[model samples]
Target: TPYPVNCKTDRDCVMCGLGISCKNGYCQGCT
Candidate 1:
């Protein structure tokens, strides 16, 4: 897997929550 998995869709990256989206191939979330 791509660490958190790089995104092509919202469900692509498995790190984002309900409101966040993919950015820079990753799920954009609070760190």
Candidate 2:
């Protein structure tokens, strides 16, 4: 599943910036 998975909500996903969320377990801006 390369298209992001197991995220209940955007909050569940790792937060990178202000509106961006992580896809796989890694944030877009933050490593």
Candidate 3:
């Protein structure tokens, strides 16, 4: 999946790839 998914909340990041989470309004992996 594409990276850097923008988000204002976890809900917005729900569409992000697995293991992806929202941080500082962006979706990123555990890296």
Per-candidate TM-score against the hidden true structure: 0.38, 0.23, 0.43
Best-fitting candidate, measured by TM-score?
3
The predicted structure with the larger lDDT, 2 or 3, is: 3
| Residue-wise C-alpha lDDT for candidate 3, range 1-31, written one tens digit per residue | 4265777665666676545567787876533
Candidate 1 lDDT over residue span 1-31, tens digit each: 2347567677665454544467787766623
C-alpha lDDT of candidate 3 relative to the true structure: 0.62
Error of 1 at 25 (Å): 1.6
Better of 1 and 2 by lDDT: 1
Rank candidates by lDDT, best first: 3, 1, 2
**How many residue pairs of model 2 clash at the backbone?**
0
TM-score preference between candidates 1 and 3, better one: 3
Predicted candidate 2 versus true structure: per-residue lDDT over 1-31, tens digit per residue: 2244334345544333343455555434422
Off by over 4 Å in 2: 1-15
Look at candidate 2 and tell me the lDDT of residue 2.
20
Regions of candidate 3 where Cα sits further than 4 Å from its true position: 17-20
